[PDB]
Symmetry: D3
Subunit: 132 residues, 6 copies
């Protein structure tokens, strides 16, 4: 049934003026905003916590640098099967119809993050909205 | 050559959410034409039960009928090349972005649109909603 | 407060695949469909009744011919101040932002009709939906 | 040169009607940038009353406050050339197609968006919603 | 009143990925492309001729610089009352519903040029499409 | 993996006023125009070369006729993995989310051509843009 998931809108969305386009796609599939924060520049520690699973990868530092290179928005969305459904909406740069498939063409500059599972959603919401 | 007609229902949730034109527009943009169309402020329960006759022994049957009479519906006959399968693909499902249900719906009952799933289904459904053959 | 008005979607809208675009503009301003009929070809008598105020004008017959040259949809819309508001949405070919202003460029092939007053709305609804 | 900041509220009716992104998108497309933004599941009555202080003696004051706390709101500070008047023009009114209110609203209370109407108003409203100057 | 007019899509439209959005607004109003050229970087001389009337203004040189700062597209559009109608579609940064009204917020970076009169359209078409 | 690919916008796109819609989908995926030509009516020889591989098929002549039945635009697009990505964007009439999937419903009148491989892109670019 009802789930909550964490979405980040990435600095490339701001640079390319695609913020509303992305949020609109999620809004049109009937998901609701439960919490939202705007960061002119996200604190690097939050970014590093968010991507901690990748801390050993060669791209870790470079990806973190990208993620602090402009604003981000962190959003908690709520709706039926929200985690999987918003993950599907995000898609990938190979899949037309999805956010990444229609709008992105890079492995790193890919516009949006959505939690990939129940456990990561719980964790990511606590990173960005520790108040709850 | 491959011209067909199919039956589409715009469901009550489309009216509630103001997505009627959005749904019709996706079909229009794929080059399918309206042949017949009726607006129902409330569809007769009898038509709904015949439409979903194949589901009559399913647990969800009565609740789905209740939903389908909870608000207006539009019944439309569309015409074009391979209309039945093409409009079914346009309809899609709530798991497939790019489709009507995939982009716009998030429930397996409140899913905005019905489209006939076969030549047999289309003949039958068109007869139900547009008996004036 | 609440009013009802009559809209015709004209044959040029069908020809140019702008039916949903036009209906969408009205739907987005929060007006509701109360009645609707699709005519593969409108009976000429209905068209002549609809435009009876113009029966003496030089363009009368030609306009009627246009209006039976393809399908039309007749719709009764309901909402606050519906008559004036939908009239404003229709606009004219000189006014960007409006249906005619954005999408039409002809005196006759202008996509949509909307009732111009309380009296004509009453009359036009009775022409297209005599049942009520 | 002519850079300004202005305060925008996305009202509860925008959430009810799923028009939040549509409204924000129109401002984004005009090349204005978000400087600050807060989501309120329910805005404090006190902030709403200060925001509409100039209307406090009007007959519609209490009802408008009730509406403004009936659902979520988003408060946003936008920045750009001539932002105050430009975003006010984007806001428009329910009589003017091409604008947010003109295209999307049909009520003088439930009208989707507020934008500051002057430099004085903007300073005051930004202070109310983003006191952390 | 069939007419032809000259449109430039400016470098800011390319920078902001608004080329199709702009062309679409003209397309939806039923104006037809008669000829079109893409310039990765327009020859400065063409720009100087195009804005010749402004050669005495203080902004001339800076405006020319902007106009060669990225690609442009030059288009001849044809349709009824095309000069006036496409001029109106262009609008200004103060008028929502128009191209500049919805999309631009600068006096120089304003996305599109459209001929403002019969004489200037003739002149501008001769500049960008001399083969004519 | 920066690449260039050749796109044709076909006469049905002009007939149906879908030119900007099609170009917009490619623009939104962040691909850049490198060169572009508008043909009021393409020289038949260019069309015959373009579809040379089909010269033995029964549909060759009729397809060529269609391709000169109205204007076309020839475009060289540049971007990461452009050939494959724009090919995927084109899609087919069975796959919603793609250009053909959302907008076309015919085997011949299918709105757009995009190069299907490295070799064909090289070849097709040489046909429409020999100056290259
Ligand atoms: N292989 C590779 N991947 C990268 C690089 N930079 C960023 N990424 C990807 O960026 C992603 C960041 O995670 P997330 O925001 O959830 O995007 P997602 O994992 O693709 O859904 C990781 O999956 C990385 O694979 C890079 O240099 N190389
Ligand atoms: N599994 C399941 N399906 C339901 C329920 N309520 C409604 N439905 C489905 O809602 C659908 C209505 O959409 P329809 O027009 O028939 O197209 P379809 O969903 O692709 O078959 C039916 O297929 C029903 O199976 C339910 O409680 N459970
Ligand atoms: N002057 C003129 N007007 C025409 C001609 N053909 C159609 N029209 C216009 O078409 C309109 C039909 O009325 P309606 O559907 O309500 O459009 P509207 O009156 O412009 O809002 C009339 O107002 C006529 O002025 C023509 O040949 N000459
Ligand atoms: N005249 C009138 N106005 C109302 C009523 N209820 C709410 N409003 C208006 O709703 C508006 C709220 O929008 P606001 O953010 O202030 O922008 P504005 O409408 O342009 O002033 C206020 O201006 C109020 O005047 C009412 O009953 N009567
Ligand atoms: N006043 C002023 N004008 C400028 C500036 N930069 C460019 N312009 C002019 O603004 C015009 C841009 O619009 P244009 O394409 O000519 O169409 P127009 O707005 O109808 O004149 C150009 O003629 C430029 O020369 C500036 O900084 N100040
Ligand atoms: N089987 C078949 N093919 C056709 C017909 N008409 C055109 N075609 C071919 O369909 C192709 C149109 O798509 P194209 O631009 O080549 O890209 P493609 O779909 O990947 O091959 C052309 O190569 C035409 O020669 C037809 O009636 N039948
Ligand atoms: Mg992710
Ligand atoms: Mg179905
Ligand atoms: Mg009228
Ligand atoms: Mg206001
Ligand atoms: Mg100009
Ligand atoms: Mg191809």
């Amino acid at each position: 049934g009802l789930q909550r998931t964490l979405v980040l809108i990435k600095p490339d969305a701001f640079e390319r003026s695609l913020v509303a386009e992305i949020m609109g796609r999620i809004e049109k599939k009937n998901f609701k905003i439960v919490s939202m924060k705007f960061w002119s520049k996200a604190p690097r520690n939050l970014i590093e916590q968010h991507y901690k699973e990748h801390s050993e990868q060669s791209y870790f530092n470079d990806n973190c640098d990208f993620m602090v290179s402009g604003p981000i928005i962190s959003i908690v969305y709520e709706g039926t099967d929200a985690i999987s459904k918003i993950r599907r909406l995000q898609g990938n740069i190979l899949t037309p119809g999805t956010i990444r498939g229609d709008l992105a063409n890079d492995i790193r500059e890919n516009l949006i993050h959505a939690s990939d599972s129940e456990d990561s959603a719980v964790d990511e919401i606590s990173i960005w909205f520790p108040e709850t």
